[PDB]
Design an enzyme around this catalytic site. Structure first.
Site, PDB file in Angstrom:
ATOM      1  N   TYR A  38      36.961  29.141   1.414  1.00  0.00           N
ATOM      2  CA  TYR A  38      37.121  29.821   0.127  1.00  0.00           C
ATOM      3  C   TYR A  38      35.964  29.480  -0.828  1.00  0.00           C
ATOM      4  CZ  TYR A  38      41.944  30.527   1.629  1.00  0.00           C
ATOM      5  OH  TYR A  38      43.080  30.842   2.367  1.00  0.00           O
ATOM      6  N   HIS A  40      36.015  33.621   0.157  1.00  0.00           N
ATOM      7  CA  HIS A  40      35.474  34.429   1.271  1.00  0.00           C
ATOM      8  C   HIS A  40      35.855  35.878   1.079  1.00  0.00           C
ATOM      9  CE1 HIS A  40      39.242  35.079   3.331  1.00  0.00           C
ATOM     10  NE2 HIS A  40      39.436  33.783   3.481  1.00  0.00           N
ATOM     11  N   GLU A  58      38.241  36.472  -2.315  1.00  0.00           N
ATOM     12  CA  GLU A  58      39.547  35.879  -2.661  1.00  0.00           C
ATOM     13  C   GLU A  58      39.359  34.360  -2.746  1.00  0.00           C
ATOM     14  OE1 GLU A  58      41.474  36.469   1.549  1.00  0.00           O
ATOM     15  OE2 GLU A  58      42.562  34.918   0.444  1.00  0.00           O
ATOM     16  N   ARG A  76      46.563  33.901  -4.552  1.00  0.00           N
ATOM     17  CA  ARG A  76      45.108  34.104  -4.640  1.00  0.00           C
ATOM     18  C   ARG A  76      44.734  35.021  -5.831  1.00  0.00           C
ATOM     19  NH1 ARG A  76      46.414  31.301  -1.170  1.00  0.00           N
ATOM     20  NH2 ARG A  76      46.175  31.546   1.086  1.00  0.00           N
ATOM     21  N   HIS A  91      51.362  35.635  -0.846  1.00  0.00           N
ATOM     22  CA  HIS A  91      52.070  35.798   0.454  1.00  0.00           C
ATOM     23  C   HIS A  91      53.586  35.804   0.187  1.00  0.00           C
ATOM     24  CE1 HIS A  91      48.873  35.498   3.431  1.00  0.00           C
ATOM     25  NE2 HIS A  91      48.447  34.355   2.926  1.00  0.00           N
ATOM     26  N   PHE A  99      49.938  40.311   2.113  1.00  0.00           N
ATOM     27  CA  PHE A  99      50.073  39.934   0.704  1.00  0.00           C
ATOM     28  C   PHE A  99      50.822  41.064  -0.041  1.00  0.00           C
ATOM     29  CE2 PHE A  99      46.042  37.560   1.604  1.00  0.00           C
ATOM     30  CZ  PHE A  99      46.363  36.348   0.973  1.00  0.00           C
TER      31      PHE A  99
END
Length: 106
Positions: A38, A40, A58, A76, A91, A99
């Site tokens: 991250y 990415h 994100e 995120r 999530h 998501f």
């Protein structure tokens, strides 16, 4: 950003902003937070109607502070390559590895 709810987790406008800013800083530095991948690339295969154009990045958002590595949690922030805020996803309430949007992201 504005205050958002991810599942039942509440984040203030400042918290969203903090995560987003961190995301930007890593992206522009071609670096990642610790041993994680991250921030990415984020592929909108689900069809979120983001208010800004891609491509996207994100990065985790958590209640306890800006992400520095370790377990990212379920939430995120999504920014574009210009560091424009796109939205917040989680999530929590999604099936499999998908998501759903935090409040305000649809």
């Amino acid at each position: 950003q504005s205050a958002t709810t991810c599942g039942s987790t509440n984040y203030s406008a400042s918290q969203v902003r903090a995560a987003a800013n961190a995301a930007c800083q890593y992206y522009q530095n071609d670096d990642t937070a610790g041993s994680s991948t991250y921030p990415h690339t984020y592929n909108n295969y689900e069809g979120f109607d983001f208010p800004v154009d891609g491509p996207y990045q994100e990065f985790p958002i958590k209640s306890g502070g800006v992400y520095t590595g370790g377990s990212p949690g379920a939430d995120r922030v999504v920014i574009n390559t210009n560091c424009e805020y796109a939205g917040a996803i989680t999530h929590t309430g999604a099936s499999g590895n998908n998501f759903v949007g935090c409040s305000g992201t649809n």
